[PDB]
Design a binder for this molecule. Structure first.
Ligand SMILES: Cc1ncc(C[n+]2csc(CCOP(=O)(O)OP(=O)(O)O)c2C)c(N)n1
Ligand SMILES: Cc1ncc(C[n+]2csc(CCOP(=O)(O)OP(=O)(O)O)c2C)c(N)n1
Ligand SMILES: [Mn+2]
Ligand SMILES: [Mn+2]
Lengths: 556, 556
């Protein structure tokens, strides 16, 4: 009889179903139409609940939680533009694999397209970007509970990667005391309510078969390219490449320890590309390669075969090489395609890489962002993790620093948005409970400024470095036209971040030299709170330093 | 020959075409893939160029510009999540009619679904929310310029209302000197380049016919309901209703002068609803009605016919009455269906409305948000405009204040999002160049916090009042469950806004009484800058005051 009561019973099935698929974290934004979902969530002891007022930040908070935990994370939002704000995080998850389960409250069908407040067309509004889309019907006891749980179980069970849009219409009344409406309906599921498994278990695995001719191919002159992978996978790939005697080109996101560091510089040297021309096979593990020189070499190389191993689906080679696209867990794949010890075939490149790093070290002293990137390994928190932002910082660290093998690195490098980096970092921290270093640019920090609210709650110290070069200086690295560059590309905002930190009662430092930076870090790691460290640098020094180093190494 | 040059020639045709359809403002966010569009725009002297770093805010800036100017406004963003961030403003425009032209740069077809950085599936990504969607092909001289301009002319010419998504793929290279590549291709348009008209003129008008039985219905017992309309339309509707002798229920968005004010209160009285049962016809002009009591009365009433007149398309009656949905400019419609002088038929409601206002007046003294809303008419800038935020503020002004006829009011009440109110207010100000009073809540201000960057550039004084009641106190008005209310609904953030103002070098006041508030107002109207006035109030006083006044008036 009670619509409000049945709404909550319907919602309770949805939420309990998710607990059977490893959902522990749920991120909730405020609203009224979402009440049945939010109250079901609040009442369910399985969840860790996170809240935020900006649904775009909420989506990215969820992204960060999923990124680190490798488990599906749920999101609840009310109807309207609240739903639209989830798009950026959903798109990124589609590219890098995070399992985001978006529970989006909706008006019932009778209030769509009739000028009702906060009512929009929500089914399909994320187009092809969710992996799965469920448009739930108007709640009714005439649809059995077993149908509802089965539909959720199909979506979660068959989810290899990416987001799920579950649209959830509810009619008013939304409020009122619970009565027994829908209880017998729920009880048709019997002791499933006390179970720890799905109602319907549907969990096919997607995996490429082992390559039977690997033992032939591993005897050839190969190159290993390591992109984004897990910290442990990076260590395994490093050992595997060494054993093969193949050069390892390691991305900043790879955690391989980058045995041939500064590839963005030495790949610019003709002696290196000449040697790499001898490669008959390239085996790339992971994807979303960072550096321009690596992307250019990848595009130009012409091995007999190009393989990409990764656990995400679809084509991952933007140069469309003849070869293989192998879907697998990287660690598992390495066990199936083991290395046998063989004499290394590269002679010139190890020397060039050493020389390249020496050239960077020679310029370590200036208090600039290139130097900060080069030295960043000196500031990584012990037993911690690094979250690297987009634009120049990820490129500078990739080109100029040698990050330790197995030290966890996280990022948003699918679509490389600058719109959710602070909120993502917050989720990254909360998921693992580890001390966290996050580094972002000034426009990036402004973009997600209100996520400083989230950083008021971290479980271990988090240092947020904001590199302030007054605008998007990546457009001083790119050959943008000088006449239009400041107004239409760089867009300097001429701000500092001391007042932003103060607004959210976060500790703040603006160090003016290396000694003050070291003192700031020493202060920051002492407590389970977020410290903002603003590094103010001259606009174009970072870009010019990279360019000068590129040129120097190309002449070695 | 030159891809970079032809990209810019292709883009120049797109941008020049827009100028023939009244596009003067263009809002641009930074990026590289957007270069052909952005350089074409920068070079075109027809445009007023606005920039911002947050694409969600950029969209709302454009929304505000369009809202006031009543012309199409263009937006340029780069590929990736930048495009997704335009969704909230596009959705709101779909509902309230703003013509937003979204030029979204894209990767070319050969770089989609292959793991390329910042490349996503963009065609159709806004689903059914744009009025028109154009997915442009990969640029080539083998497609003639006359096709490109004709497609743009079709989209703009036939655009009654709402957004247009124009997806614009460009292949690299994007940079390089202009040469003559594509010049002869452009010149196929001949002296269209020196013309002031579209290439293809396609502009059918959509309008309902004269109602031939209006002379019959205008003699009946009617009620006029006035929703959102232009300031001039509000004055016309007031005079028209007055002439007919029909009671006018005027929304805060109507600018009718609200001759029967506090309708949200007196509609709660059974005597008013009893009198309204006599209405044989209801003529509603405008839509998006604000108040709960009005929405409830509208839903319950049973006149022989219910008419809704508005220049927006589609059903606008969420109660689905028997009647008519008439598409027209409201001022035009009134001229086509003029009033006849007739004796007013309502007797009780004028009594109740006066009594309701006296009840509110009796409680005007406390320094609270209800009192601020009641008194806001006393503080409107001369020759200015009011921008009213969402949640409690719009409801309190609607329920408790009597706004002057023809005094411009602007709002985002289609989807009623709290995600873009500051950036929308900026656009509203820039469009008219008028002194602006903007009022929003604390979560709303946090949501669009970085839009304070935009408010650093206003052409006349803008007073931004932030009502800080520590959370979304609309959920103290709604019957939300007390146990979950704070954590999962109200979400207090426990901040103030002095540091936010300081960050963007905006003047700031936190007045503690009316004298200090009036002093702040006086100072603020003196210069063409934004002043932030933070009104800190006890969390639940506003909601409770509204609840008490409702009860008091219901018992009259
Ligand atoms: C949501 C979004 N909008 C636009 C872009 C394009 N973009 C890439 S880098 C960049 C500049 C970032 O500026 P900042 O954070 O100051 O970093 P810097 O370039 O100075 O290193 C922009 C606007 C993007 N990647 N994501
Ligand atoms: C983008 C978006 N997310 C969520 C909502 C639901 N909602 C309506 S009002 C409101 C609270 C706004 O809080 P505040 O700005 O402090 O205003 P107050 O309720 O205190 O008047 C919320 C979350 C919305 N309208 N838009
Ligand atoms: Mn910067
Ligand atoms: Mn509030």
């Amino acid at each position: 009889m009670s619509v409000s009561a049945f709404n909550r019973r319907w919602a309770a099935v949805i939420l309990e179903a998710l607990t059977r698929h490893g959902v522990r974290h749920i991120c909730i934004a405020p609203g009224s139409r979402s009440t049945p979902l939010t109250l079901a969530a609040a009442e369910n002891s399985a969840f860790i609940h996170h809240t935020h007022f900006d649904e775009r930040g909420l989506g990215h908070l969820a992204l960060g939680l999923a990124k680190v935990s490798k488990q599906p994370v749920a999101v609840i939002v009310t109807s309207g533009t609240a739903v639209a704000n989830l798009y950026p995080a959903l798109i990124e998850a589609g590219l890098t694999g995070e399992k985001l389960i978006l529970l989006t409250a909706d008006r019932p069908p009778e209030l769509i397209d009739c000028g009702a407040n906060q009512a929009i067309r929500q089914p399909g509004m994320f187009a092809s970007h969710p992996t799965h889309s469920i448009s739930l019907p108007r709640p009714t006891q005439d649809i059995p509970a077993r149908w509802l749980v089965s539909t959720i179980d199909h979506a979660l069970g068959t989810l290899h990667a990416g987001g799920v849009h579950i649209n959830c219409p509810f009619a008013e009344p939304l409020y009122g005391e619970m009565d027994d409406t829908g209880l017998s309906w729920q009880q048709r599921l019997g002791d499933w309510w006390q179970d720890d498994k799905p109602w319907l278990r549907e969990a096919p695995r997607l995996e490429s078969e082992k390559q039977r001719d690997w033992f032939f191919w591993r005897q050839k002159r190969g190159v290993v390219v390591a992109g984004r992978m897990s910290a442990e996978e990076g260590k395994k790939v490093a050992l595997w490449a060494q054993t093969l005697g193949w050069p390892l080109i390691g991305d900043v996101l790879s955690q391989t320890g980058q045995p041939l560091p500064c590839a963005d510089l030495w790949l610019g040297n003709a002696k290196a590309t000449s040697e790499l021309q001898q490669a008959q096979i390239v085996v790339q593990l992971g994807s979303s390669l960072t550096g321009k020189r690596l992307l250019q070499w990848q595009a130009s190389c012409e091995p007999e075969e190009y393989w990409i191993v990764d656990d995400i689906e679809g084509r991952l080679d933007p140069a469309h090489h003849r070869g293989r696209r192998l879907i697998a867990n990287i660690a598992d794949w390495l066990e199936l395609h083991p290395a046998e010890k063989r004499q290394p075939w590269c002679v010139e490149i190890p020397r060039l890489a050493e020389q390249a790093m020496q050239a960077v070290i020679a310029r370590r002293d200036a208090f600039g962002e290139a130097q900060l990137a080069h030295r960043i390994c000196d500031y990584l928190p012990e037993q911690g993790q690094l979250f690297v932002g987009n634009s120049l910082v990820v490129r500078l660290i990739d080109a100029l620093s040698q990050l330790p093998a197995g030290y966890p690195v996280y990022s948003n490098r699918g679509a490389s948005g600058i719109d959710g980096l602070l909120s993502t970092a917050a989720g990254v921290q909360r998921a693992s409970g580890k001390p966290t270093l996050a580094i972002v640019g000034d426009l990036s920090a402004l973009y997600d400024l209100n996520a400083l609210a989230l950083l008021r709650q971290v479980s271990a110290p988090l240092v947020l470095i904001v590199v302030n070069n007054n605008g998007g200086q990546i457009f001083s690295l790119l050959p943008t036209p000088q006449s239009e560059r400041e107004r239409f590309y760089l867009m300097p905002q001429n701000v500092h971040f001391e007042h932003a930190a103060a607004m959210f009662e976060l500790k703040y430092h603006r160090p003016q030299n290396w000694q003050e930076l070291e003192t700031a870090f020493a202060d920051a790691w002492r407590t389970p709170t977020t410290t903002v460290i603003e590094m103010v640098v001259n606009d174009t020094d970072g870009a010019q330093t990279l360019q000068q180093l590129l040129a120097q190494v190309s002449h070695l």
